Amino acid sequence: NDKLVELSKSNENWVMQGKDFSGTHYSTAKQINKDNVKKLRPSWSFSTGVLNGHEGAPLVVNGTMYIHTPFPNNTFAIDLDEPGVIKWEHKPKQDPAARAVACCDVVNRGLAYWPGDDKAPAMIVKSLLDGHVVALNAETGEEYWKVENGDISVGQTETAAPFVAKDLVIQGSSGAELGVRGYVTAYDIHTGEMVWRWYATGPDADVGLDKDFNKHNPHYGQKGLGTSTWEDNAWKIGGGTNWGWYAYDPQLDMFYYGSGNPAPWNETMRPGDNKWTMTIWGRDLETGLAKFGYQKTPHDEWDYAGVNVMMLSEQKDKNGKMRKLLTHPDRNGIIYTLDRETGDLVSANKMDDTANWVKKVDLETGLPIRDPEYGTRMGHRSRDVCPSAMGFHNQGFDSYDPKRELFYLGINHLCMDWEPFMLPYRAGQFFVGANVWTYPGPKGDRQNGIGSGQVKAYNAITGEFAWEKMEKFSVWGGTTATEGGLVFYGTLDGFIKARDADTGKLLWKFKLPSGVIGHPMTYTHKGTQYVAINYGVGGWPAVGLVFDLNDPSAGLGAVGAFKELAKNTQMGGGVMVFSLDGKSPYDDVSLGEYGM
Amino acid sequence: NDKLVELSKSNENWVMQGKDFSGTHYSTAKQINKDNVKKLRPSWSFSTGVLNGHEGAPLVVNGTMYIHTPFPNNTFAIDLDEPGVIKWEHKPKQDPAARAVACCDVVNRGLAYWPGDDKAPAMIVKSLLDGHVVALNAETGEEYWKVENGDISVGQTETAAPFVAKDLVIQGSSGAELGVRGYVTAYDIHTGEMVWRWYATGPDADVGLDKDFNKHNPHYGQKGLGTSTWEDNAWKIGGGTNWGWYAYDPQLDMFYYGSGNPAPWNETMRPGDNKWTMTIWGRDLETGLAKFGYQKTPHDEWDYAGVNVMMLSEQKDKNGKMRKLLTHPDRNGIIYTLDRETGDLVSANKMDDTANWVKKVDLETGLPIRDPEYGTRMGHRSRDVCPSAMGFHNQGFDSYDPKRELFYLGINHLCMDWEPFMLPYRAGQFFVGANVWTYPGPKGDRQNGIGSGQVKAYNAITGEFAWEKMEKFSVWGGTTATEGGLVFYGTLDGFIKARDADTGKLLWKFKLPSGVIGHPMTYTHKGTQYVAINYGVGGWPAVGLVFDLNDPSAGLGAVGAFKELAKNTQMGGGVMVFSLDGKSPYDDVSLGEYGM
Amino acid sequence: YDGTKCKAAGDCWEAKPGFPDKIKGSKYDPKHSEKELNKQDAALKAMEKRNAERVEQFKKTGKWVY
Amino acid sequence: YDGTKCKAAGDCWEAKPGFPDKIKGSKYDPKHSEKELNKQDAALKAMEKRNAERVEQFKKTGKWVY
Ligand SMILES: O=C(O)c1cc(C(=O)O)c2c(n1)C(=O)C(=O)c1cc(C(=O)O)[nH]c1-2
Ligand SMILES: O=C(O)c1cc(C(=O)O)c2c(n1)C(=O)C(=O)c1cc(C(=O)O)[nH]c1-2
Ligand SMILES: [Mg+2]
Numbered sequence A, B: 001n002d003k004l005v006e007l008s009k010s011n012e013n014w015v016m017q018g019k020d021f022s023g024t025h026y027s028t029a030k031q032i033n034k035d036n037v038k039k040l041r042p043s044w045s046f047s048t049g050v051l052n053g054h055e056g057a058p059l060v061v062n063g064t065m066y067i068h069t070p071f072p073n074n075t076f077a078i079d080l081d082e083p084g085v086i087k088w089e090h091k092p093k094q095d096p097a098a099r100a101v102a103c104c105d106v107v108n109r110g111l112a113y114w115p116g117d118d119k120a121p122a123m124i125v126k127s128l129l130d131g132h133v134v135a136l137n138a139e140t141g142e143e144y145w146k147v148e149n150g151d152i153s154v155g156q157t158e159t160a161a162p163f164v165a166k167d168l169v170i171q172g173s174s175g176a177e178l179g180v181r182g183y184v185t186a187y188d189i190h191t192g193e194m195v196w197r198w199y200a201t202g203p204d205a206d207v208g209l210d211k212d213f214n215k216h217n218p219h220y221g222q223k224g225l226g227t228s229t230w231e232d233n234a235w236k237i238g239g240g241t242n243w244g245w246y247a248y249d250p251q252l253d254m255f256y257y258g259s260g261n262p263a264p265w266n267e268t269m270r271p272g273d274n275k276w277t278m279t280i281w282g283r284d285l286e287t288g289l290a291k292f293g294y295q296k297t298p299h300d301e302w303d304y305a306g307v308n309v310m311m312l313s314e315q316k317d318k319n320g321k322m323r324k325l326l327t328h329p330d331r332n333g334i335i336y337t338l339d340r341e342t343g344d345l346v347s348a349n350k351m352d353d354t355a356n357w358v359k360k361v362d363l364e365t366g367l368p369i370r371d372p373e374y375g376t377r378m379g380h381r382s383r384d385v386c387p388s389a390m391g392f393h394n395q396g397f398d399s400y401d402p403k404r405e406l407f408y409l410g411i412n413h414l415c416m417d418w419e420p421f422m423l424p425y426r427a428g429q430f431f432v433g434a435n436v437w438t439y440p441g442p443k444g445d446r447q448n449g450i451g452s453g454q455v456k457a458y459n460a461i462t463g464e465f466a467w468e469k470m471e472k473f474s475v476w477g478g479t480t481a482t483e484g485g486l487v488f489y490g491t492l493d494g495f496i497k498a499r500d501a502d503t504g505k506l507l508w509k510f511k512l513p514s515g516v517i518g519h520p521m522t523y524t525h526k527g528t529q530y531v532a533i534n535y536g537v538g539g540w541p542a543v544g545l546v547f548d549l550n551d552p553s554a555g556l557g558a559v560g561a562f563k564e565l566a567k568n569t570q571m572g573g574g575v576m577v578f579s580l581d582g583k584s585p586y587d588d589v590s591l592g593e594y595g596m
Numbered sequence C, D: 001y002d003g004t005k006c007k008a009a010g011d012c013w014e015a016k017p018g019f020p021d022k023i024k025g026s027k028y029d030p031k032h033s034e035k036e037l038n039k040q041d042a043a044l045k046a047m048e049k050r051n052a053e054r055v056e057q058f059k060k061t062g063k064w065v066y
């Protein structure tokens, strides 16, 4: 979308979850910098009126902040000139049964925005847990259309943010833990019409392959593999849902995202590479056809759901050639960098060297060389496998400073024991088939339940870390970087923090009401730079607190890794907004006062 | 309690809901004052993990903050040296059926603290909605005892804060809207033993009268009136619950509180003065026996439940004589000032002159002269009655500046239509019997649903207001005053505000996450003055928002008066803490950082 | 009825125009069930008995058993 | 099974030692119901049809009717 491209250039706006189509989360605003970030204080705040995890972050455009919540997925709009007034709200009516088929808390990763044209005014686009995608008039909040994009009776939900590019709304899928076959769908914003829909497994007619699919890398595999790497019809319930993030290159007119884990978690019930789960896609926008597809984790044994963030950059490779790239920190603990036109593998490095399911990724063959000692299988309990199923990286939307050429990665340091079990598939029921016990990795403090996070600054070409910092808990919510030399992120124990972009030194932090599982965002309004963040702990790490669980293997293995969270945070739900010296519209005390 | 008296002298402590036994809510701390209050911004924050209304405020004693919540009434302790760590928690198990017999949201007005002696350690004391009173070890949070003080099956609940004086825990009662006969009970903190229990209606044997009851004012009434001002056994379900506040004079060894409304709201079903509902009590502490009782509202026709705050002072009367006083802003719109030794009526002035059920209170006869034009009765729709049942003052704990000799009153400007109807009594079911429509009063903006609050500064001897200020919504949560010349309060539309104590000029305000229905509190820690407040809107004014109601007469008449609240706030639940420049323990960024 | 006419100290109630001094037998008779009226006293007495038992045991053992 | 031995481009799966090349008829046979397997696709096809009807009516009337 040409207008989104232009809007994203302005510091007045944050028009999509990733800030820009490249997913940089990079702000050129410098008002807040290394020398004054300690003066950052809350300007104003807003409670969402719901609890459970608050992922994603607000959008800001046209001088309005747009805020989403977890189930029932309410939307609020706020005029930034008077933040205490709710300009409009949208409160969906949903079957509460939708809660029961969400594996990992009733989270939602946020709104999208389409700027309007001469046939339709600007729209806010939201997803609902019960499977719907809804387009709302951005100014008024009134429904423009509502389409069905998932049926909870067969285990489908939606938690991902919709993604707008040109005049399409693209929505992914959730429910691999219930045997849902992944599907990605585009709707025309003007008419609500379905433009295409493509699947992660099955016949090529279902998967949507361009005639030149993987032409530059035929060894990745090409035709027929969506069935031939499965036994009989197991692909029909084969997972590969895409519930994370997208990137988009307007010049190539291609979008990029990863498909998720195969189902069930029990690897013995699905022999074969299980393509095209766990795959990095480069798809043509208008037709949705795949130009390349690289499978990161053939025959997944670990639930390394391949849905994580895509960050686009242009850098010179080791041969001195300028390359258009994507960089992608996977659940499996490898940071993938590919040429985003050809799909060529440029680098594939461990985000932490304790990762042990794979020895290395061979860049020539493109294959991860497995260490059988850390695989999983029926009849065996695998121990001290790194990463955990929760990943060395999960859904957090990270950042890339294009001047420093550094990616700022919010990382989990988590490992696990794992043992599969046999089970039947019944539509609408869970279909996991493994018992899991997750805990802090070797560099942390497993006996004390802490040291399960890291923040690292990474160069995708050299593979080196500019700096590495340990965190008390997994850094779940992503990161945002600015030309002020700052990297912002929130923590599960309830802080927003800023580190020095060059050294990683901790410069500032503030105790929010609840832990953070979304990313910071920033915007400038009437000359003042603001930093805002969701708070309200939840998602996978906090299922123990949120659902009152105690068994260490409960919450798909999360509960035993995060028992100490409840000593540092409780549930919550809201937005906190920060500025230098807490400068605020309400510094004019007459603003909003009765009778003016 | 001698130790509580001593602890309350220090600015490091806030040891009871009223700050001190006189209920002054007055701080001598001057770090924050009228000329630097604009520098106040959040220091740190804490989500309670629950929604609905958050009444009362935290306590602070010997370096620890104690925090309570609405149902299910969880307790948190936090060491102020590291506010992000929860030192201990207490999470009661209660029948959720308790929610259904709460008339006016599942609020709780807070903790009490008993400072310990050689037989038992210091204790935190809490009430539960389901009627229990619980004593917890203050250091560890472990249960010391738990007694039954109400049975939800007959309509009893508990929302009031327990009150500690000497070694007694005193607890009130709730449920007049379900025909509960009011009872007040004392328990020994060491043993859990019930020391006395006295009722608001019935034979004198139940009410607990000293032989000298109303000796100085026999025209108030003395013996037998708990039955003789009722017809037959209607007093058995006659209301008079006490769910508000107490004050205590250690020298007189007397405590003071008001009893609530008679049941049902239908006045025609209970002919008679209905004593001793609606009564100001002065009772001996150790025996509970009443030394005086003044009925403010004989034969209530309006639900002016007489439970509001008591504030003690010593001032010269109009004749120049020093008097020991209590001052009490009633739901019925009259501010009562009595001699707290004799019970003598000193002044009884309208807190706003639009009050019209009463022409004036005759100080000689003690009687409110009724205007029959604004009474209620079967077969009649009463119109434009002021105050509303919600009162010109409700449960907010206000403040008194003893140097300025001014009471800072958080007031509601609300009037009503009212029409009773006949109904039967069934134990455990509601027993209201009136349809009610509340709206902003004449000085506000009825047609736009706003102008329903006031803040006024009041001298109890002259009856003069030093200043009067309008507020968009009813000021529900009380006020706190300091020798920095500041009056703090929170508002239903989600602000904490500071006004000039001398002029009422608005000096500062900050947008909290949710509306406020509890009072500000303050304390000093390691040389820094902090102001803290609960947020999380609810209680009677916000039942429309909290329970999704739209009929104007719903929520006992409140819904039609507060429809605009939802445009300014959503639900929430937490504590926000403020200091000059947001100074915080986490200014040391290493505090609480891994490792480890 | 303006509240200023008192048949005794503390008793100034009067019927409003057209209303009876007593409502028993009138159209306003609440006809309360006397056994319903007694239920909250019974409930309170039961709780008092249970608390007292807890208190006696507490004095003996030093640990509260609800 | 180290992932490096490939049957064809994009197909490098091997059974682990002790495990069969195919699990049908084995202890690990999932014995999936084809009827259950097809339910997802049925649900999505139904939603596509209902969406299409909404789209057609939207084009006709200019206001979305769910
Ligand atoms: O398999 C799926 O389709 C699906 C959905 C989700 C989701 O929809 O939130 C998660 C996962 N998988 C998953 O594997 C996972 O680790 C995870 C973490 C979270 C979270 O937001 O904290 N959601 C999900
Ligand atoms: O009659 C009663 O016993 C009882 C209880 C309460 C309560 O327990 O919260 C209120 C009332 N009455 C009442 O009349 C009232 O206006 C009221 C307001 C509130 C509130 O906290 O917002 N509680 C109560
Ligand atoms: Mg998954």
Ligand SMILES: [Mg+2]
Residues within 6 Å of the ligand: B176, B177, B260, B261, B303, B305
């Ligand atoms: Mg009442």
